[PDB]
């Protein structure tokens, strides 16, 4: 009853229902997400007010689904799901060190090596006939990159290793959205497995440090540092799992969506191929300076995130009753922000369903609080530049070497768990560039 005065209803996903309702009912709409009543706020004024202030914190009730699943601790109080400001701020500032300019520049070798491995595997299949799941291949690449970059481990998913691990991730993500008997069993065991991987890799790191082996400072270094005097390792494992999942899942989804969309954009692909040819030539390795020169690719990736944001948005807690765009919203209410919804509204983007990289051209007016694929403010993505770099490296190497055609019958639709991803496996046939 407390929300009844708020406007609202009396490969298609929940975000699409939200889009319809925002269009029908306006900038402040009452909805149902993760069992609770929330209010979807879609004016840029609101985006600015709530996301760009340390006064507004994440809503713990909406993050409970990440913290624990079916009685199994998952992301716990890790960096994504911690909703206490002071607790978040402590760990954020420590982990920030792993995402310094110099830290990320040093990762270029890892990005290049995994991208090169992917391309060599695809080249051998490029007979214009063999169907290849680009969703799968890009997920394996993203995982291999993350495991090495963040934790100094070799998952070798591109070599067909760690199949149970990939199964565990899938079942766990299904688990988040779920919240019969067999599904519960599978989800719980998957979560415990991932945390055990954490214990294993943490023990390996500690052993290396004791034996005085060389350990390059990485994300794991800072995750350990953040827990320097904790009672137990549960906080450490929270962050292990957080970074293990967040560090590859969205990157993989972003790559897959981009490949999927580009399969129906031959002119844009031709332009991208030309840009890569001109900037890097036949070089096997992209330098950091090369990344900045791939300006058209940067625009295409931005436009991909407008239409296909893997991370659709965020929640903040409204503590006190507040007027939001002429609507009285009661205190203690989750506000839902969605870059997916706003990206597809004609009031914010002309011809919203058209894929046009020119929206992000140098001279074009920049979206003002209508586009936030990495979120905004203090709780924005710590991994934003990491992700931007790795995806540019992967995409550039694909464009350098291969032509992709989507297998007829493959859909452009979405599926939604916690994050958005292609409904279909992005099955493509491949040919080497140059006939
Ligand atoms: C293209 C890929 C990516 C996208 C679109 C993306 C998007 C986002 C979004 C929307 C948030 C806000 C989440 C929320 O409010 O619940 C976020 C936060 C976060 N992301 Fe990412 N992300 C990406 C890649 C990465 C990578 C590569 C890492 C780690 C290596 C990462 C780690 C995180 C973490 C730890 C947070 C929580 C930050 C904080 O609250 O202090 N993400 N990301
Ligand atoms: O679910 C939410 N955030 C969320 C969830 C996930 C998950 F579950 F797929 F692991 C991953 C990321 C992420 C952020 N950066 C990279 O991955 N974010 C909030 C409540 C809406």
Short mmCIF file of C-alpha atoms and ligand atoms in Angstrom, two decimals:
data_model
loop_
_atom_site.label_atom_id
_atom_site.label_comp_id
_atom_site.label_asym_id
_atom_site.label_seq_id
_atom_site.Cartn_x
_atom_site.Cartn_y
_atom_site.Cartn_z
CA UNK A 1 0.00 0.00 0.00
CA UNK A 2 2.87 2.38 0.82
CA UNK A 3 3.94 2.35 -2.85
CA UNK A 4 0.53 2.13 -4.57
CA UNK A 5 0.44 5.87 -5.40
CA UNK A 6 3.63 5.49 -7.50
CA UNK A 7 3.00 5.04 -11.28
CA UNK A 8 3.29 1.44 -12.48
CA UNK A 9 1.55 -1.74 -13.77
CA UNK A 10 -1.67 -2.86 -11.94
CA UNK A 11 15.00 -13.70 -25.98
CA UNK A 12 13.01 -11.07 -24.04
CA UNK A 13 14.19 -10.34 -20.50
CA UNK A 14 13.09 -8.59 -17.29
CA UNK A 15 14.99 -5.45 -18.34
CA UNK A 16 12.72 -5.33 -21.42
CA UNK A 17 9.61 -5.38 -19.23
CA UNK A 18 11.18 -2.52 -17.26
CA UNK A 19 11.83 -0.61 -20.50
CA UNK A 20 8.17 -0.94 -21.53
CA UNK A 21 7.05 0.28 -18.12
CA UNK A 22 9.46 3.24 -18.05
CA UNK A 23 8.13 4.25 -21.48
CA UNK A 24 4.50 3.76 -20.40
CA UNK A 25 4.62 5.10 -16.84
CA UNK A 26 7.48 7.62 -16.85
CA UNK A 27 10.73 8.33 -14.93
CA UNK A 28 9.68 6.82 -11.56
CA UNK A 29 7.96 3.41 -11.66
CA UNK A 30 7.16 0.84 -8.97
CA UNK A 31 8.28 -2.69 -9.90
CA UNK A 32 9.19 -6.07 -8.38
CA UNK A 33 12.84 -7.17 -8.37
CA UNK A 34 14.30 -10.02 -6.29
CA UNK A 35 11.10 -10.40 -4.22
CA UNK A 36 11.00 -6.79 -2.96
CA UNK A 37 9.21 -3.69 -4.23
CA UNK A 38 11.67 -1.29 -5.83
CA UNK A 39 11.37 1.95 -7.79
CA UNK A 40 12.99 2.25 -11.22
CA UNK A 41 14.41 5.74 -11.70
CA UNK A 42 15.26 6.68 -15.29
CA UNK A 43 15.73 10.44 -15.45
CA UNK A 44 19.36 11.68 -15.92
CA UNK A 45 18.71 14.14 -13.07
CA UNK A 46 18.08 11.16 -10.77
CA UNK A 47 21.06 9.20 -12.12
CA UNK A 48 23.28 12.17 -11.29
CA UNK A 49 21.75 12.83 -7.86
CA UNK A 50 21.91 9.29 -6.52
CA UNK A 51 24.95 7.73 -8.22
CA UNK A 52 27.29 10.73 -7.90
CA UNK A 53 26.96 11.09 -4.10
CA UNK A 54 28.61 9.19 -1.25
CA UNK A 55 25.42 9.98 0.69
CA UNK A 56 23.60 7.24 -1.22
CA UNK A 57 24.77 3.69 -0.53
CA UNK A 58 23.88 0.33 -2.08
CA UNK A 59 20.76 -1.39 -0.74
CA UNK A 60 21.81 -4.48 1.22
CA UNK A 61 18.42 -6.17 0.72
CA UNK A 62 18.97 -6.16 -3.05
CA UNK A 63 22.53 -7.52 -2.73
CA UNK A 64 21.52 -10.38 -0.40
CA UNK A 65 21.12 -12.58 -3.50
CA UNK A 66 24.84 -12.12 -4.28
CA UNK A 67 25.96 -12.50 -0.65
CA UNK A 68 24.48 -15.97 -0.04
CA UNK A 69 22.69 -18.47 -2.29
CA UNK A 70 20.58 -21.31 -0.82
CA UNK A 71 22.46 -21.02 2.48
CA UNK A 72 25.91 -21.02 0.82
CA UNK A 73 28.12 -17.93 1.18
CA UNK A 74 29.03 -16.69 -2.31
CA UNK A 75 30.19 -13.09 -2.80
CA UNK A 76 29.64 -12.43 0.92
CA UNK A 77 31.00 -9.00 1.90
CA UNK A 78 33.33 -8.70 -1.12
CA UNK A 79 33.80 -5.48 -3.07
CA UNK A 80 30.60 -5.71 -5.16
CA UNK A 81 28.21 -6.82 -2.44
CA UNK A 82 29.48 -4.95 0.65
CA UNK A 83 26.93 -2.21 1.40
CA UNK A 84 28.54 -0.63 4.48
CA UNK A 85 30.40 2.48 3.27
CA UNK A 86 33.34 2.31 5.69
CA UNK A 87 33.87 -1.43 5.13
CA UNK A 88 33.66 -0.94 1.36
CA UNK A 89 35.95 2.11 1.37
CA UNK A 90 38.75 0.32 3.26
CA UNK A 91 38.90 -2.59 0.82
CA UNK A 92 38.36 -0.42 -2.27
CA UNK A 93 41.36 1.82 -1.55
CA UNK A 94 43.64 -1.18 -0.92
CA UNK A 95 42.54 -3.12 -4.02
CA UNK A 96 42.72 0.07 -6.15
CA UNK A 97 46.53 -0.35 -6.14
CA UNK A 98 46.25 -3.40 -8.43
CA UNK A 99 44.46 -1.26 -11.02
CA UNK A 100 47.04 1.54 -11.17
CA UNK A 101 48.24 2.73 -14.59
CA UNK A 102 51.56 0.88 -14.16
CA UNK A 103 49.81 -2.30 -12.95
CA UNK A 104 47.50 -2.43 -15.98
CA UNK A 105 50.25 -1.59 -18.48
CA UNK A 106 52.19 -4.61 -17.18
CA UNK A 107 49.20 -6.83 -18.08
CA UNK A 108 49.52 -6.15 -21.82
CA UNK A 109 51.70 -9.26 -22.25
CA UNK A 110 48.98 -11.46 -20.68
CA UNK A 111 46.23 -9.85 -22.78
CA UNK A 112 48.29 -10.33 -25.96
CA UNK A 113 49.26 -13.94 -25.22
CA UNK A 114 45.73 -15.14 -24.48
CA UNK A 115 44.30 -13.22 -27.46
CA UNK A 116 46.97 -14.73 -29.70
CA UNK A 117 46.17 -18.21 -28.41
CA UNK A 118 42.46 -17.68 -29.12
CA UNK A 119 43.15 -16.43 -32.66
CA UNK A 120 45.44 -19.38 -33.45
CA UNK A 121 42.75 -21.83 -32.26
CA UNK A 122 40.07 -20.12 -34.36
CA UNK A 123 42.34 -19.87 -37.44
CA UNK A 124 42.69 -23.66 -37.52
CA UNK A 125 38.87 -23.90 -37.65
CA UNK A 126 38.41 -21.18 -40.28
CA UNK A 127 37.11 -23.43 -43.08
CA UNK A 128 33.84 -21.49 -43.56
CA UNK A 129 31.90 -24.59 -42.47
CA UNK A 130 32.81 -25.66 -38.92
CA UNK A 131 30.39 -24.01 -36.41
CA UNK A 132 32.23 -22.32 -33.52
CA UNK A 133 30.57 -20.98 -30.36
CA UNK A 134 32.10 -17.53 -30.02
CA UNK A 135 30.32 -17.14 -26.67
CA UNK A 136 32.18 -20.21 -25.37
CA UNK A 137 35.52 -19.29 -26.96
CA UNK A 138 35.39 -15.72 -25.64
CA UNK A 139 34.41 -16.93 -22.15
CA UNK A 140 37.40 -19.30 -22.10
CA UNK A 141 39.69 -16.45 -23.19
CA UNK A 142 38.32 -14.06 -20.57
CA UNK A 143 38.69 -16.69 -17.83
CA UNK A 144 42.27 -17.55 -18.87
CA UNK A 145 43.20 -13.84 -18.91
CA UNK A 146 41.63 -13.20 -15.49
CA UNK A 147 43.10 -16.28 -13.79
CA UNK A 148 46.61 -15.31 -14.92
CA UNK A 149 46.34 -11.52 -14.52
CA UNK A 150 44.59 -11.52 -11.13
CA UNK A 151 45.86 -14.71 -9.48
CA UNK A 152 48.91 -15.82 -11.50
CA UNK A 153 47.28 -19.18 -12.32
CA UNK A 154 46.86 -21.00 -15.66
CA UNK A 155 43.29 -22.27 -16.11
CA UNK A 156 44.02 -23.32 -19.73
CA UNK A 157 40.32 -23.24 -20.59
CA UNK A 158 41.33 -22.46 -24.20
CA UNK A 159 43.03 -25.89 -24.20
CA UNK A 160 39.82 -27.57 -23.01
CA UNK A 161 40.84 -27.78 -19.33
CA UNK A 162 38.74 -26.95 -16.25
CA UNK A 163 35.38 -28.14 -17.60
CA UNK A 164 33.98 -28.71 -14.04
CA UNK A 165 34.99 -25.13 -13.17
CA UNK A 166 33.02 -23.75 -16.13
CA UNK A 167 30.05 -25.90 -15.07
CA UNK A 168 30.29 -24.54 -11.52
CA UNK A 169 30.20 -20.92 -12.72
CA UNK A 170 27.16 -21.57 -14.92
CA UNK A 171 25.16 -23.34 -12.19
CA UNK A 172 26.07 -20.69 -9.63
CA UNK A 173 24.89 -17.85 -11.88
CA UNK A 174 21.62 -19.73 -12.53
CA UNK A 175 21.43 -20.07 -8.74
CA UNK A 176 21.55 -16.30 -8.14
CA UNK A 177 18.46 -15.77 -10.31
CA UNK A 178 16.62 -18.85 -9.02
CA UNK A 179 16.55 -17.30 -5.53
CA UNK A 180 14.18 -28.66 -7.42
CA UNK A 181 16.05 -30.98 -5.04
CA UNK A 182 18.76 -31.71 -7.62
CA UNK A 183 19.07 -28.04 -8.65
CA UNK A 184 19.65 -27.04 -5.00
CA UNK A 185 22.30 -29.77 -4.70
CA UNK A 186 24.07 -28.66 -7.90
CA UNK A 187 24.04 -24.96 -7.01
CA UNK A 188 25.26 -25.43 -3.43
CA UNK A 189 28.08 -27.78 -4.51
CA UNK A 190 29.11 -25.30 -7.25
CA UNK A 191 29.43 -22.43 -4.77
CA UNK A 192 31.45 -24.57 -2.33
CA UNK A 193 33.67 -25.69 -5.23
CA UNK A 194 34.49 -22.11 -6.26
CA UNK A 195 35.35 -21.15 -2.67
CA UNK A 196 37.54 -24.28 -2.42
CA UNK A 197 39.38 -23.19 -5.58
CA UNK A 198 39.97 -19.95 -3.66
CA UNK A 199 41.36 -21.81 -0.64
CA UNK A 200 43.60 -23.84 -2.99
CA UNK A 201 45.01 -20.84 -4.88
CA UNK A 202 45.43 -18.82 -1.66
CA UNK A 203 47.41 -21.69 -0.11
CA UNK A 204 49.57 -21.88 -3.26
CA UNK A 205 50.30 -18.14 -3.05
CA UNK A 206 51.21 -18.36 0.64
CA UNK A 207 53.51 -21.33 -0.06
CA UNK A 208 55.31 -19.44 -2.84
CA UNK A 209 55.81 -16.43 -0.55
CA UNK A 210 57.28 -18.66 2.18
CA UNK A 211 59.62 -20.57 -0.15
CA UNK A 212 60.70 -17.12 -1.37
CA UNK A 213 59.66 -17.68 -4.99
CA UNK A 214 58.99 -14.70 -7.24
CA UNK A 215 55.39 -13.50 -6.98
CA UNK A 216 54.38 -10.52 -9.21
CA UNK A 217 52.08 -8.14 -7.32
CA UNK A 218 48.54 -8.70 -8.61
CA UNK A 219 44.89 -8.42 -7.55
CA UNK A 220 45.37 -11.37 -5.18
CA UNK A 221 48.24 -9.51 -3.49
CA UNK A 222 45.89 -6.64 -2.60
CA UNK A 223 42.98 -8.94 -1.67
CA UNK A 224 45.34 -10.60 0.84
CA UNK A 225 46.53 -7.15 1.98
CA UNK A 226 42.94 -6.06 2.66
CA UNK A 227 42.49 -8.96 5.10
CA UNK A 228 45.83 -8.45 6.91
CA UNK A 229 44.43 -9.02 10.41
CA UNK A 230 41.03 -10.67 9.90
CA UNK A 231 39.69 -13.36 12.26
CA UNK A 232 39.41 -15.91 9.43
CA UNK A 233 39.83 -16.20 5.64
CA UNK A 234 36.12 -15.79 4.84
CA UNK A 235 36.52 -12.15 3.72
CA UNK A 236 39.51 -13.18 1.60
CA UNK A 237 37.41 -15.89 -0.07
CA UNK A 238 34.53 -13.43 -0.60
CA UNK A 239 36.88 -11.26 -2.68
CA UNK A 240 38.48 -14.23 -4.41
CA UNK A 241 35.08 -15.32 -5.73
CA UNK A 242 34.01 -11.74 -6.48
CA UNK A 243 37.06 -11.09 -8.66
CA UNK A 244 37.04 -14.60 -10.14
CA UNK A 245 33.50 -14.08 -11.48
CA UNK A 246 33.27 -10.31 -12.02
CA UNK A 247 36.73 -10.33 -13.60
CA UNK A 248 35.69 -12.47 -16.59
CA UNK A 249 31.89 -12.83 -16.84
CA UNK A 250 30.95 -9.32 -18.00
CA UNK A 251 34.06 -9.01 -20.18
CA UNK A 252 33.12 -12.31 -21.88
CA UNK A 253 29.48 -11.21 -22.36
CA UNK A 254 30.61 -7.83 -23.77
CA UNK A 255 32.88 -9.58 -26.29
CA UNK A 256 30.15 -12.05 -27.31
CA UNK A 257 27.52 -9.31 -27.79
CA UNK A 258 29.98 -7.29 -29.89
CA UNK A 259 30.83 -10.25 -32.15
CA UNK A 260 27.12 -11.12 -32.42
CA UNK A 261 26.12 -7.56 -33.41
CA UNK A 262 29.05 -7.07 -35.80
CA UNK A 263 27.99 -10.21 -37.73
CA UNK A 264 25.17 -8.12 -39.22
CA UNK A 265 27.24 -4.95 -39.70
CA UNK A 266 29.57 -5.66 -42.68
CA UNK A 267 30.31 -1.98 -43.38
CA UNK A 268 31.30 -1.31 -39.77
CA UNK A 269 33.39 -4.50 -39.80
CA UNK A 270 35.14 -3.36 -43.01
CA UNK A 271 35.96 -0.06 -41.28
CA UNK A 272 37.25 -1.85 -38.17
CA UNK A 273 39.40 -4.19 -40.30
CA UNK A 274 40.86 -1.15 -42.08
CA UNK A 275 41.62 0.62 -38.79
CA UNK A 276 43.42 -2.42 -37.33
CA UNK A 277 45.35 -2.86 -40.60
CA UNK A 278 46.51 0.77 -40.45
CA UNK A 279 47.41 0.95 -36.76
CA UNK A 280 49.08 -2.39 -36.00
CA UNK A 281 49.68 -3.79 -39.51
CA UNK A 282 50.82 -7.42 -39.29
CA UNK A 283 52.32 -7.10 -35.78
CA UNK A 284 51.48 -10.01 -33.48
CA UNK A 285 51.56 -7.73 -30.44
CA UNK A 286 49.56 -4.61 -29.55
CA UNK A 287 51.49 -2.08 -27.48
CA UNK A 288 49.69 0.07 -24.92
CA UNK A 289 50.09 3.11 -27.20
CA UNK A 290 48.34 1.24 -30.03
CA UNK A 291 45.19 0.92 -27.90
CA UNK A 292 44.63 4.69 -27.94
CA UNK A 293 44.88 4.78 -31.75
CA UNK A 294 42.05 2.27 -32.21
CA UNK A 295 39.56 5.13 -31.97
CA UNK A 296 36.85 3.63 -34.18
CA UNK A 297 37.04 0.33 -32.27
CA UNK A 298 36.63 2.28 -29.01
CA UNK A 299 33.44 3.82 -30.41
CA UNK A 300 32.04 0.46 -31.57
CA UNK A 301 32.68 -1.04 -28.12
CA UNK A 302 30.95 1.93 -26.46
CA UNK A 303 27.93 1.55 -28.77
CA UNK A 304 27.90 -2.18 -28.01
CA UNK A 305 27.64 -1.34 -24.28
CA UNK A 306 24.79 1.09 -24.97
CA UNK A 307 22.55 -1.59 -26.52
CA UNK A 308 24.02 -4.65 -24.77
CA UNK A 309 25.29 -3.75 -21.26
CA UNK A 310 26.16 -7.09 -19.52
CA UNK A 311 25.83 -5.30 -16.18
CA UNK A 312 22.46 -3.65 -16.57
CA UNK A 313 22.62 -1.33 -13.54
CA UNK A 314 22.61 -1.01 -9.74
CA UNK A 315 20.55 -0.29 -6.61
CA UNK A 316 20.80 2.48 -4.04
CA UNK A 317 18.95 2.80 -0.75
CA UNK A 318 16.70 5.83 -0.37
CA UNK A 319 16.75 6.38 3.40
CA UNK A 320 14.29 9.29 3.74
CA UNK A 321 11.06 10.13 1.90
CA UNK A 322 12.07 12.14 -1.18
CA UNK A 323 10.38 13.78 -4.16
CA UNK A 324 11.82 12.21 -7.33
CA UNK A 325 10.68 13.82 -10.61
CA UNK A 326 7.37 14.92 -9.07
CA UNK A 327 6.75 11.54 -7.38
CA UNK A 328 6.72 11.04 -3.60
CA UNK A 329 8.94 8.03 -2.87
CA UNK A 330 8.78 6.67 0.73
CA UNK A 331 11.84 6.26 2.94
CA UNK A 332 13.66 2.90 3.01
CA UNK A 333 13.10 2.08 -0.66
CA UNK A 334 15.48 0.43 -3.17
CA UNK A 335 16.03 2.65 -6.20
CA UNK A 336 16.85 0.71 -9.39
CA UNK A 337 19.04 2.30 -12.09
CA UNK A 338 19.31 0.69 -15.52
CA UNK A 339 21.68 1.67 -18.33
CA UNK A 340 19.88 -1.00 -20.39
CA UNK A 341 16.53 0.78 -20.06
CA UNK A 342 17.88 4.28 -20.64
CA UNK A 343 19.98 3.12 -23.60
CA UNK A 344 16.81 1.99 -25.40
CA UNK A 345 14.62 5.03 -24.70
CA UNK A 346 14.04 7.39 -27.64
CA UNK A 347 13.90 10.31 -25.20
CA UNK A 348 17.63 9.76 -24.52
CA UNK A 349 18.89 8.27 -27.80
CA UNK A 350 17.52 9.06 -31.26
CA UNK A 351 16.62 5.84 -33.13
CA UNK A 352 17.67 3.82 -30.04
CA UNK A 353 17.67 0.40 -31.71
CA UNK A 354 20.08 1.54 -34.45
CA UNK A 355 23.71 0.48 -33.91
CA UNK A 356 25.62 3.68 -34.73
CA UNK A 357 29.23 4.02 -33.44
CA UNK A 358 29.16 7.67 -34.59
CA UNK A 359 27.20 8.47 -31.40
CA UNK A 360 30.58 8.23 -29.65
CA UNK A 361 32.56 10.18 -32.26
CA UNK A 362 35.04 12.89 -31.05
CA UNK A 363 32.81 15.84 -31.98
CA UNK A 364 29.51 14.26 -30.86
CA UNK A 365 27.78 15.51 -27.64
CA UNK A 366 28.57 13.02 -24.87
CA UNK A 367 25.60 11.30 -23.13
CA UNK A 368 24.93 13.16 -19.89
CA UNK A 369 23.88 10.62 -17.24
CA UNK A 370 21.99 8.44 -19.76
CA UNK A 371 24.77 5.87 -20.30
CA UNK A 372 26.62 4.03 -17.52
CA UNK A 373 27.78 0.49 -18.50
CA UNK A 374 30.41 0.58 -15.72
CA UNK A 375 28.09 2.48 -13.35
CA UNK A 376 29.00 5.94 -11.97
CA UNK A 377 30.35 7.49 -8.78
CA UNK A 378 32.17 5.83 -5.88
CA UNK A 379 30.67 2.40 -6.68
CA UNK A 380 31.72 2.42 -10.34
CA UNK A 381 33.55 -0.60 -11.78
CA UNK A 382 37.05 -0.95 -10.31
CA UNK A 383 37.85 -3.12 -13.35
CA UNK A 384 36.72 -0.62 -16.02
CA UNK A 385 40.13 0.13 -17.56
CA UNK A 386 41.25 -3.50 -17.18
CA UNK A 387 38.15 -4.57 -19.12
CA UNK A 388 38.48 -1.85 -21.77
CA UNK A 389 42.10 -2.83 -22.42
CA UNK A 390 41.57 -6.59 -22.57
CA UNK A 391 38.52 -6.37 -24.82
CA UNK A 392 40.31 -4.02 -27.25
CA UNK A 393 43.26 -6.44 -27.43
CA UNK A 394 40.98 -9.43 -28.08
CA UNK A 395 38.79 -7.62 -30.62
CA UNK A 396 41.75 -6.11 -32.50
CA UNK A 397 43.42 -9.50 -32.90
CA UNK A 398 40.18 -11.09 -34.14
CA UNK A 399 39.67 -8.29 -36.69
CA UNK A 400 43.30 -8.51 -37.81
CA UNK A 401 43.09 -12.18 -38.69
CA UNK A 402 39.54 -13.50 -39.15
CA UNK A 403 36.17 -12.99 -40.85
CA UNK A 404 33.05 -14.18 -38.98
CA UNK A 405 29.58 -15.08 -40.25
CA UNK A 406 26.78 -15.92 -37.81
CA UNK A 407 25.27 -19.34 -38.52
CA UNK A 408 21.71 -18.79 -39.90
CA UNK A 409 19.13 -19.38 -37.17
CA UNK A 410 21.31 -17.87 -34.43
CA UNK A 411 19.32 -15.27 -32.51
CA UNK A 412 20.22 -11.74 -31.39
CA UNK A 413 18.06 -12.10 -28.27
CA UNK A 414 19.21 -11.84 -24.66
CA UNK A 415 19.09 -13.97 -21.55
CA UNK A 416 19.16 -12.51 -18.05
CA UNK A 417 20.67 -13.97 -14.93
CA UNK A 418 22.38 -11.49 -12.64
CA UNK A 419 23.95 -10.17 -15.87
CA UNK A 420 22.83 -10.03 -19.50
CA UNK A 421 24.35 -12.24 -22.19
CA UNK A 422 23.42 -13.66 -25.64
CA UNK A 423 20.55 -16.15 -25.58
CA UNK A 424 22.35 -18.24 -28.20
CA UNK A 425 26.01 -19.43 -28.26
CA UNK A 426 26.95 -16.96 -31.05
CA UNK A 427 27.70 -19.87 -33.44
CA UNK A 428 29.82 -18.56 -36.33
CA UNK A 429 31.73 -19.90 -39.29
CA UNK A 430 35.16 -18.35 -39.82
CA UNK A 431 37.50 -17.62 -42.72
CA UNK A 432 41.06 -16.15 -42.59
CA UNK A 433 41.28 -12.56 -43.79
CA UNK A 434 42.47 -12.43 -47.40
CA UNK A 435 40.04 -14.78 -49.22
C1 LIG B 1 33.07 -4.96 -19.82
C2 LIG B 1 33.18 -5.55 -18.63
C3 LIG B 1 32.61 -4.99 -17.38
C4 LIG B 1 31.44 -4.31 -17.14
C5 LIG B 1 30.42 -3.92 -18.18
C6 LIG B 1 31.37 -4.04 -15.74
C7 LIG B 1 30.32 -3.33 -15.14
C8 LIG B 1 30.26 -3.05 -13.79
C9 LIG B 1 29.16 -2.43 -13.15
C10 LIG B 1 27.88 -1.96 -13.79
C11 LIG B 1 29.48 -2.33 -11.82
C12 LIG B 1 28.58 -1.78 -10.73
C13 LIG B 1 27.96 -3.05 -10.11
C14 LIG B 1 26.90 -2.81 -9.06
O1 LIG B 1 26.58 -1.65 -8.72
O2 LIG B 1 26.33 -3.80 -8.54
C15 LIG B 1 30.77 -2.90 -11.63
C16 LIG B 1 31.41 -2.99 -10.41
C17 LIG B 1 32.52 -3.81 -10.25
N1 LIG B 1 33.22 -4.47 -11.22
FE1 LIG B 1 32.87 -4.45 -13.10
N2 LIG B 1 32.45 -4.55 -15.14
C18 LIG B 1 33.25 -5.13 -16.06
C19 LIG B 1 34.48 -5.77 -15.90
C20 LIG B 1 35.09 -5.98 -14.67
C21 LIG B 1 36.38 -6.53 -14.46
C22 LIG B 1 37.32 -6.96 -15.56
C23 LIG B 1 36.58 -6.57 -13.08
C24 LIG B 1 37.74 -7.06 -12.29
C25 LIG B 1 38.91 -7.40 -12.83
C26 LIG B 1 35.39 -6.05 -12.47
C27 LIG B 1 35.19 -5.95 -11.11
C28 LIG B 1 34.20 -5.14 -10.57
C29 LIG B 1 34.12 -4.92 -9.11
C30 LIG B 1 35.03 -5.52 -8.06
C31 LIG B 1 33.08 -4.09 -8.90
C32 LIG B 1 32.64 -3.53 -7.56
C33 LIG B 1 33.38 -2.18 -7.42
C34 LIG B 1 33.03 -1.41 -6.15
O3 LIG B 1 31.85 -1.38 -5.75
O4 LIG B 1 33.93 -0.81 -5.48
N3 LIG B 1 34.52 -5.69 -13.47
N4 LIG B 1 31.23 -3.33 -12.86
O1 LIG B 2 24.16 -8.36 -9.67
C1 LIG B 2 24.66 -7.27 -9.46
N1 LIG B 2 25.95 -7.00 -9.77
C2 LIG B 2 26.86 -7.90 -10.36
C3 LIG B 2 26.67 -9.28 -10.37
C4 LIG B 2 27.61 -10.09 -11.01
C5 LIG B 2 27.47 -11.59 -11.05
F1 LIG B 2 26.47 -12.05 -10.22
F2 LIG B 2 27.23 -12.02 -12.33
F3 LIG B 2 28.66 -12.17 -10.65
C6 LIG B 2 28.71 -9.50 -11.61
C7 LIG B 2 28.84 -8.12 -11.56
C8 LIG B 2 30.03 -7.50 -12.18
C9 LIG B 2 30.47 -6.23 -12.06
N2 LIG B 2 31.60 -6.10 -12.79
C10 LIG B 2 31.86 -7.25 -13.34
O2 LIG B 2 30.91 -8.12 -12.99
N3 LIG B 2 27.93 -7.37 -10.95
C11 LIG B 2 23.84 -6.15 -8.86
C12 LIG B 2 22.57 -6.46 -8.05
C13 LIG B 2 22.45 -5.93 -9.48
#
